[PDB]
Amino acid sequence: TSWSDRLQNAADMPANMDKHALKKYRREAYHRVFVNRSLAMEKIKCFGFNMDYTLAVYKSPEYESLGFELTVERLVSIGYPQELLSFAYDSTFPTRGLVFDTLYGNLLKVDAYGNLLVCAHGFNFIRGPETREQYPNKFIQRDDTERFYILNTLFNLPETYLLACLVDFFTNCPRYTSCETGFKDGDLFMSYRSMFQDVRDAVDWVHYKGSLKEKTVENLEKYVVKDGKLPLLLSRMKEVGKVFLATNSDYKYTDKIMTYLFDFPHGPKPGSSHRPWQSYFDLILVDARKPLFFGEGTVLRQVDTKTGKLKIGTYTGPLQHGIVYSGGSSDTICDLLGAKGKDILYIGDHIFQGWRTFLVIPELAQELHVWTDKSSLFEELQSLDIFLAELYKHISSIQRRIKKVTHDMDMCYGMMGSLFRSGSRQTLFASQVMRYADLYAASFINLLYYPFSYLFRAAHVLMPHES
Amino acid sequence: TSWSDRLQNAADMPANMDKHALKKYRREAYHRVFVNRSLAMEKIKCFGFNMDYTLAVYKSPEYESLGFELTVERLVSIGYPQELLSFAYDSTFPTRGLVFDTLYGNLLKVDAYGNLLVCAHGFNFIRGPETREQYPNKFIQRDDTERFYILNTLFNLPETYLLACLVDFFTNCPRYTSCETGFKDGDLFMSYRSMFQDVRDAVDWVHYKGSLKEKTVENLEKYVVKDGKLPLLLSRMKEVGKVFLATNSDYKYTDKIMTYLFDFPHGPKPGSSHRPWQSYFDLILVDARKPLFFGEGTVLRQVDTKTGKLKIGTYTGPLQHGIVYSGGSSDTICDLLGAKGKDILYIGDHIFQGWRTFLVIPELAQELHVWTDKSSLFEELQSLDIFLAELYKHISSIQRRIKKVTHDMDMCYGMMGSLFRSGSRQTLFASQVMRYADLYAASFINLLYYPFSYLFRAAHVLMPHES
Amino acid sequence: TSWSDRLQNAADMPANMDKHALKKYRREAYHRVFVNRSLAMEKIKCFGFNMDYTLAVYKSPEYESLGFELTVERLVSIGYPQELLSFAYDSTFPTRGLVFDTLYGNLLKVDAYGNLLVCAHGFNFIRGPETREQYPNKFIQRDDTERFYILNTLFNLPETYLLACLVDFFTNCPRYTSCETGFKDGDLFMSYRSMFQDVRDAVDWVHYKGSLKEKTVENLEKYVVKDGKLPLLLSRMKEVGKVFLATNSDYKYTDKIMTYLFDFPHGPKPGSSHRPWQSYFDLILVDARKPLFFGEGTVLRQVDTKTGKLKIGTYTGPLQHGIVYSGGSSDTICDLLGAKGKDILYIGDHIFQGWRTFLVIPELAQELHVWTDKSSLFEELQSLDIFLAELYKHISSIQRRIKKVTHDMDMCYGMMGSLFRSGSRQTLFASQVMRYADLYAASFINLLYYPFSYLFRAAHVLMPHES
Amino acid sequence: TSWSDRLQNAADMPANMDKHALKKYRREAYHRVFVNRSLAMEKIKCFGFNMDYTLAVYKSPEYESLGFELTVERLVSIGYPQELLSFAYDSTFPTRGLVFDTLYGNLLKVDAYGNLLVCAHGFNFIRGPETREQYPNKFIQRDDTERFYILNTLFNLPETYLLACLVDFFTNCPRYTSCETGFKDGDLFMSYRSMFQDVRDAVDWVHYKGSLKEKTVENLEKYVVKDGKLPLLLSRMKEVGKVFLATNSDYKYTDKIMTYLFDFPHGPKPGSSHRPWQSYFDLILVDARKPLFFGEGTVLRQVDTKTGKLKIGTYTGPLQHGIVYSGGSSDTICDLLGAKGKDILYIGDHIFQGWRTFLVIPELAQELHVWTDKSSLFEELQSLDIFLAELYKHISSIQRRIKKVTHDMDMCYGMMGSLFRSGSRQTLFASQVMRYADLYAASFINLLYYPFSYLFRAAHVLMPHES
């Protein structure tokens, strides 16, 4: 069961909206909204949305698999060897948030402080003594952005796997000779950095210039989760505040996707008349150019919605319906909606004054199921950790047991472990979720199970001396 | 009782070094080392020290009071009105870590996200509706470094108070007319920013060009804590690894201070021969120029210890005793000591690859005593917070009670509240301690009560969905 | 007669290489190499070449006209009104080096100090009092790169004209209302900056993603000057040093163009066997990414010349023939050729340690012919200028005569005047030629008329007090 | 005869102000204003002045000699060896504008393109083959500001000489061993960069914290040129526009100096009543902080002229007399004077929108006298250069004669040659004068010999192809 199977299983449920129905439903972890920082819902005046992996949850492993194959085909088409065509996408290998080391050709899982949790070269997992040869203190400086690339997004999933496949292919194929920083074909030296750049370029091309969008849109049932509860949540939000869409996609793609997502023989609830997806938003903005959108942005433009092209000129005046914007900035959205900063909840799949944030983490659906299965393994980890400290206070192969249990726990998630941790150690990714997302969940649909004056309450944080 | 009275009270204790003596002593909060991130002491190869507020704990309120009066006298001497001489330092007003808003002339206490916890203009505490006139969402952007200055250090204590005294003086004196961004004397407009810059300049002058050092050094008994347990801890550290000093002070000041700190009729333990302070360090570095020291540093120089002046030339070769360095960088120290990054524990009073860190927070001695007195007040705060969320889930003047209890709790610390929080809300400062200090305590002497293979163990951190 | 007609007329000449034939030929201005800074040819070890407008001189006005029409068609295709299709390229309007002011929608000709020489909004030439309304001291700051874009290159010729056509169209068409900073279509405001960005984007697209290259290469006789003297000069250079090509074009385009340029029934001289264009270069580098090429560059790659695609890997070793590189940097070229800086003459059409520089200015052929026709007009300008200063030393409508003669002289060049001056005032462009080009000429073929040990001699420069 | 003897000789002349008296006086080079760029004096609305080396011309070699000795004494006082006290300042060695290479300890004279004209290590002049060992193409990159320091100002004269004295001392003294990048005293290595930084620090200290100002002001007759024609020129300027002073000096120093400069028993002309120096300026600004003054500046303050200290507050309103400002910016001056950019002539000794510029070059007085003596030597240089090019066109020891004559010409200026050239090659400094100074002269007093509607006329500049 993929995480998107879990989302699609819950998506097939009709909404029972009775008071205690919604109450007993948000006991179940997969349907809860988790809280890093308290947030009074009653004080939210606008709800903003990204499209991709937020409203439009691409099905897994199919969509990753499509991205992977189109990227492989782009690499072959620009000169990569034919053997690449025999790769097939394996959803059990990649974990989101890995670091690619372009110097050595390794994928690294790290904590917030640069400590290495997992190191793999191709499909070989480096450990202990041999890791320290390339990572002296088992440490990487993540802000050496010229060397290390953080594979942070869900669109980075196929290329996470592809990079491993390639290092493995060049490392094991006898045409090639392995080096520390790349590989030779006869006297021809190819660095892992050049190779990483070709992949990155090929992923960009598939998205901006290749057939990814085209192939998605011809089979939306295969590639995109559809949930009848979407128009219901959005119409409920529009009762209590304004709703907006800000997406990086162009207008034609957004329209095709959004039309599919609202394509039910009904509107908010069954039995009601269907309405156009545009009717659910007070403001629709495409070609947003995030993350630049959140800074200086680009000039505000306006789409001719019959042609999908930009108008010559932009409607100057106040917010009125019918209009679709393009570019601009998040500050321009505030001005148009008449609401600033903490009055705004922005719901998206990516971790980037000051809007409140709801982070959708689609993997959380499967992570939650494994987490509860492993509870014993984690509890033992805590005990060993506690007992180890007891020994040092005043033979001591508790360390090897700690190493063993940590591996076992991790393998249940896939080869690169949990998104959020390796054994008792939190990932870079988990720390950034905690620092940057006020609220997070497997799906934003989970908001539907809470009343709109709900006070989301974070646990009181105490310093070590306060506890 | 000042925090430095607490440190000086514990400093008058001889060291009972029996096994269970040290065990039962580090139950008591004021003598514990607190742990943000686990640290195996057995793996530490070098211990590094800042001098000021670390080895040399300046007595409070006397030292702040000396800084304050010399700074006031500098301002008068450069053209400030005579009424400044009737100011007297009040240790109950300043809390460390306040933000001075140079636009409006307010001191602000803030959380890590920019939310205003406390706003005071002079000695008037702005609240609710009137705060929102200048701080629209009750929010400041701390990284607008041209407007906001964070009064982060213990040397900033007198000027925190001085800035308040000045705004209060100009605001209430009838020679002057108040404006939003400063004040007039007839047609003469003086901004709060100019005024803040004069104070900052005057504090710098007192330290670098005035009589602060001179007045300290003529009365060390009045201004500096002396603790006979210092040579004992340091000699214990030198048994298990290397010890170094890196200070911003010049050689003559360091020598005067360090000689006083080792001035006992004995060495490590009573009954042992006294030794020079220099014998306790494998490496001594002065004129360090922190924080530049931690980056590119400056060229490595060497002090002629009979004159206190730089030698022409620097000893190129390996670490040998007798030598005192000047300038250089933290990377140069690693090279000389033959140990990198996580092998090093650096002990200092200020929050700035990668050395482990022990943060000395002298105020923690008094904060800990108030914390335990207020436990009831905090517990009520938690209950109200929890009960408030219960109401919103489905008249509601729980908010006014929350506002009231928060004030009451805060006033026990002084007018600007606790260093670490305002009621249930953590300060910017507390967050930075948690992010940047592996270990922290009221005093580094607390290390003496733990065995040198101790494993300092942080609580396992769980994400909201893991708990 | 276009400048490229002049180049093509001289290109139809066979080379008479007798000693005094070449001597009497380089008396004639159009065949001379002009010298800003002395250069001993005997000391040059390598000759480097850009392709475009250097080896491959695109015919004018045809090539500009092709660029213009493909750019117009791109704008219409993305939403610009149909009336754009009735524009036709006018080679008499643009002068190279104009500044587009994106705030006001004006083309400006300026001197090196920011002084306005010519201001045109669409096809209306603003003068005197009305210029000072938008340019207070008749001055622009060229390094305000967000506002002002310098239309420096020969590829900028069509868009120089296009920008004028567009401002004129929107200004005179009654669908639209004129504003200071753009224009309205009803309530729709379009800024000149947005409009400039669309043009710039459309020019980029025509070059990188549209049919410009395709249409060039299907009719090379119409679009590119062919000169039988090219292989002769290059073979002469290869006798005395190394020859290299560094171009931004990809391999397939370069090969098509370069094959055409060497397509004669003969090699260096008539009667000799034809050889491949590649045989004339010790080093060939494509996808150079200038100007980044001159700094950090990109990784050095290698082209598979049978497919036109990059090889996986790059030949590590010393320079050997057969190899074609891609990317890299100018420092990598030096390493490969074994010659640095002043040992290298780089021949190109664009003004960008330290290679010597030969600047090809194709317009110089027509500018030289007008210059000599206007000699009287310029001489009068000097006299009026001198006589004006005589009056002020001690009614004075010498200023209006100076204004009149300056206009008359300028109109002989086209509407925006000479590339190098407006009357007695030198352009920004002329100053940059003098500062940055050691040698310059209408064509690099002019090198053929000088012996290869020639000492190019600049006039001794004297300061005003030395003269 | 020093350059300041020449200025003081002309300063002893009374002003004969008859029409043709002033006409025949500005035939003589030493009394002319030279013109790089034309400037209509009739269009100038404000005249701005720096103080130092502009209004206050420090006598040479005395003032350099005072700076030198106080700097030497500062170095000894901070640990430099006693032998430094036996240095004596030699005004024949330094030429302004030399580059100190902190890597190798050489002074370099360079042209605008980085070409080495003169290289000296201590007092040894490196030539030919041995220069190329450290400067591969005889070239330095001046914008490598971490390595190369340009000794641009007249205050840099003593330290130019001092740096040479020191390299010579450490190189020839047998306590020390020479290295490529510094020198050893036993095992102690001292780099030339550290040594350069100590000198630079010591020069700064002498100026800001030592006795330079004090020693100047106690003997103004010895250190500062006094010219009775100063009040006359300034009063003439104030007839036709506004006059302002912007200086980096504080108020007390400025007042002492300016009082001395106006200390005559008369005002503008003999026979007229004396007036205070302040009466000659519409605006007086001290503590200007140039060059920051020309950018963002610092806050505008106001001096209490009875105490010399800053007022608390600044007079907000329009320009009125009596007021003395401090800090601020050049934009603030424009606002106060009601005149922008090209309406302003700024007269100073240093080469730094857009004020017109008059550069005072005190050395020009002696340079002009040598220039005319060497006219033959330069004319031969031109002939050899021309004849050399004639040979290469088609044994050739014209090069050694060119090398010889160039040396001979140069030695007439002092050991480091002319400020403006080495033989036929212009210095970096000469190029910057030509690029940045509209007008220049040995003294600004030269303005007195031109009528105030004079049109300063630059020679028409032609490109090589236009001539």
Side-chain angles (χ1 to χ4, degrees), chain C residues 23 26-27 29 32 34-37 40 42-43 112-113 115 137 139 141-142 340-343 354 361 364 367-368 371 378 381-383 385-386 388-389 392-394 399 418 420-421 424 426 429-431 433-436 440 451 453-455 457 460-467, chain D residues 23 26-27 29 32 34-37 40 42-43 112-113 115 137 139 141-142 340-343 354 361 364 367-368 371 378 381-383 385-386 388-389 392-394 399 418 420-421 424 426 429-431 433-436 440 451 453-455 457 460-467:
Chain C
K23 195 168 278 202
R26 68 184 203 247
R27 292 305 105 97
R32 292 186 39 199
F34 303 98
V35 187
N36 293 133
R37 271 180 298 294
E42 197 220 31
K43 297 179 199 166
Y113 293 89
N115 301 302
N137 282 72
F139 162 92
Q141 177 41 265
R142 89 168 95 108
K340 282 155 199 176
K342 282 130 282 277
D343 297 330
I361 314 180
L364 189 52
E367 294 267 341
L368 281 163
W371 180 251
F378 190 87
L381 225 34
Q382 298 187 254
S383 289
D385 287 342
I386 284 173
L388 176 71
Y392 267 120
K393 193 191 161 205
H394 281 245
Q399 320 210 108
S418 179
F420 301 114
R421 59 176 53 255
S424 82
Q426 293 188 300
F429 189 91
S431 317
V433 171
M434 296 174 76
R435 214 213 174 280
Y436 295 114
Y440 73 92
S453 269
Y454 199 74
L455 172 45
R457 197 184 61 76
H460 287 100
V461 180
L462 297 181
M463 290 184 71
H465 73 96
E466 290 180 329
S467 60
Chain D
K23 195 168 278 202
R26 68 184 203 247
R27 292 305 105 97
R32 292 186 39 199
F34 303 98
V35 187
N36 293 133
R37 271 180 298 294
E42 197 220 31
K43 297 179 199 166
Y113 293 89
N115 301 302
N137 282 72
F139 162 92
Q141 177 41 265
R142 89 168 95 108
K340 282 155 199 176
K342 282 130 282 277
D343 297 330
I361 314 180
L364 189 52
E367 294 267 341
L368 281 163
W371 180 251
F378 190 87
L381 225 34
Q382 298 187 254
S383 289
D385 287 342
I386 284 173
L388 176 71
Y392 267 120
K393 193 191 161 205
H394 281 245
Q399 320 210 108
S418 179
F420 301 114
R421 59 176 53 255
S424 82
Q426 293 188 300
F429 189 91
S431 317
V433 171
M434 296 174 76
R435 214 213 174 280
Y436 295 114
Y440 73 92
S453 269
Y454 199 74
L455 172 45
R457 197 184 61 76
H460 287 100
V461 180
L462 297 181
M463 290 184 71
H465 73 96
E466 290 180 329
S467 60

Side-chain angles (χ1 to χ4, degrees), chain A residues 3-23:
Chain A
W3 51 256
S4 79
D5 291 320
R6 309 274 178 188
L7 303 165
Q8 190 60 79
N9 289 342
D12 300 327
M13 258 48 199
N16 193 289
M17 289 299 280
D18 192 60
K19 200 165 83 283
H20 296 115
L22 302 175
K23 195 168 278 202

